[PDB]
Amino acid sequence: AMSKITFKDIYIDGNKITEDSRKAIYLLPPQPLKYASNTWIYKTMPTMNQWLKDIEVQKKMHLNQSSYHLSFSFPANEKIDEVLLEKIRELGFQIGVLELYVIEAKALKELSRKRDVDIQLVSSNNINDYLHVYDAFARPFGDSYANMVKQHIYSSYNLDDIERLVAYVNHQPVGIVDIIMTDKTIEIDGFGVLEEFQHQGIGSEIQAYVGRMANERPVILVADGKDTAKDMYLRQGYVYQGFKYHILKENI
Amino acid sequence: AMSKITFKDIYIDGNKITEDSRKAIYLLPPQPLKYASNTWIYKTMPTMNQWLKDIEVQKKMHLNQSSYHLSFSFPANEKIDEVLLEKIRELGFQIGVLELYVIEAKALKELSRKRDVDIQLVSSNNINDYLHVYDAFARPFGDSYANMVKQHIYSSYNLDDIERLVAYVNHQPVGIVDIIMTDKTIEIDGFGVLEEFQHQGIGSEIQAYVGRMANERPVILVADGKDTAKDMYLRQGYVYQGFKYHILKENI
Ligand code: NA
Ligand code: NA
């Protein structure tokens, strides 16, 4: 049953505009600068020529809402043909891989050691502590991008259905994670612990907490190449369950 | 049999200058700027004070041969203790994790093939080709770093007991790997494929080769926290098998 889990179970924070047998197109017109909410998810491999045509479509959509990047995911567990890779490189895209990790709840429950780490659901009361930790995270697209993602969370955190955690050690906020719950699964996203507080059991407390929420729901996540928590995931017991290629050009 | 692989099977590229119940010490005085070759491998957690003492011993040796790094690995699959870890941060050390992966040779042999790739053993006749690829990896880290690993390879590629492979596409050198062989296992290391040539079956073809030559020996490797190919090893079937914390301090 945790066997059957796939990339389809992973949450996407866009509006789905179109979905057909080859691709799903996502946009978030009020937030055209969020790269993860504005993208094409392929279901079947485009030929090189198809891909060129799809560039043109996406280029128009995005410029129409003042989005300035381009991005695509390719099918689960499919390698891209040479000829298309070659084009991808020539058009100045970054190539990366998303990896799907899966684990059974009980395995995360087991991680608990009754450390003194106080873990709270975020509300208007502690939301700033959450963002405070967030502020420490790698910023691969620079400051102003991180800041506009901050503003988005800070104004959509009740409103949205996503739940969030902040861990404290001695009343200082130190760890965060987002959780997306469904009947079938629970997905974590945006997990991080401040550098100075790593490798000392704080992440595994957060994980076991999520584990206790899950019940017997599997818990799942997706990580890319610039994800430093991955090492932690493996040591923690997560099982690798497939990949997606994905490309990004930050400027049309 | 693949069950019983440990970090013990992993080759250390240094002279074991001494060993006892709590540690082994490794020096390589012709290369005093090669961090991995000049280090202590712990077999048991030092206490914090024990460690303070050990810095002193290592500092001495290293300074005597013109090393100015401090370097320590901790025992397989153990978390560092609380006291100890505060001191490590306090003394300005970098903290890392090293990961052991293992696979049966059969699995490697099974990988999708790309028969139009030519893989040769390195010798006098094609060493410059290994280095064409090896240099493209190293030189992003500075000419001076890359000049020194370069001379290090040139001083022992025949005389040491590492074997090396170079991979050609269209008579051009495109990927490489080093192979440390023993009766029980083949270890790979320094695996790399030029970026123009990545994700299109070459790594897999190389991996398959290593499988054929491993025959029935488990194929193993350790990957640090800055390892390009980590995602590829997962795609190819490699099983995570354990971790080791290690610490580095430069410019002591
Ligand atoms: Na919410
Ligand atoms: Na040799």
Coil, helix or strand for A213?
Answer: helix
Q: Chain A residue closest to B246 (CA)?
A: A199
H/E element, A77: none
What's the CA gap between A79 and A242, in Å, rounded? 12
What's the CA gap between A99 and A189, in Å, rounded? 13
Is A246 in contact with A97 (CB distance < 8 Å)?
Answer: yes
From the DSSP assignment, how many helices (H) and strands (E) are in chain B?
Answer: 7, 11
Is A23 in contact with A41 (CB distance < 8 Å)?
Answer: yes
Number of domains present in the structure of chain B: 1
What's the CA gap between A150 and A145, in Å, rounded? 9
Q: What is the radius of gyration, based on Cα positions, of chain A? A: 19
Interface test with B, best of A100, A117, A200, A231 (most B CBs within 10 A): A231
Buried-exposed string A42-61: b where 16+ CB fall within 10 A, e elsewhere: beebbeeeebeebbeebeeb
Deposited resolution, Å? 2.3
Measure Cα distances from B79 to A234, B37, B93 in Å: 14, 23, 16
Q: What are residue B247's phi and psi, to 5 degrees?
A: -130, 145
Q: Which ligand is nearest to the CA of A164?
A: 1
Is B57 in contact with B174 (CB distance < 8 Å)?
Answer: no
DSSP β-ladder status, A39-42 and A70-73 = parallel
Is A209 in contact with A119 (CB distance < 8 Å)?
Answer: yes
Residues of B whose CB is below 8 A from A95: 198-199
Which of B97, B198, B234 lies at the smallest CB-CB distance from A231?
Answer: B97
Is B245 in contact with B80 (CB distance < 8 Å)?
Answer: yes
Residues of B whose CB is below 8 A from A245: 199
What's the CA gap between B143 and A118, in Å, rounded? 48
Is A217 in contact with A180 (CB distance < 8 Å)?
Answer: no
CATH code for the domain of B120: 3.40.630.30
Q: Chain A residue closest to B244 (CA)?
A: A235
Neighbouring residues of A85: CB distance < 8 A, sequence distance ≥ 6: A95, B199, B200
Report which residue type is found at A152: H
What's the CA gap between B20 and B42, in Å, rounded? 10
Q: Which ligand is nearest to the CA of B130?
A: 2
How open is the CA angle A233-A238-A241, to the nearest 5 degrees? 115
Measure Cα distances from A166 to A117, A120, A232 in Å: 10, 6, 18
Which chain B residues have any C-beta within 8 angstroms of a chain A C-beta? 79-80, 82, 85, 89, 95, 97, 99, 196, 198-201, 225, 230-231, 234-235, 240, 243, 245
Domain that holds residue B216: 1-252
With tokens 């993208």, the residue in question is: A39
The string of DSSP letters for B182-242 reads: -SS-EEEEEEEE-GGGTTSSHHHHHHHHHHHHHTTS-EEEEE-TT-TTHHHHHHHTPEEEE
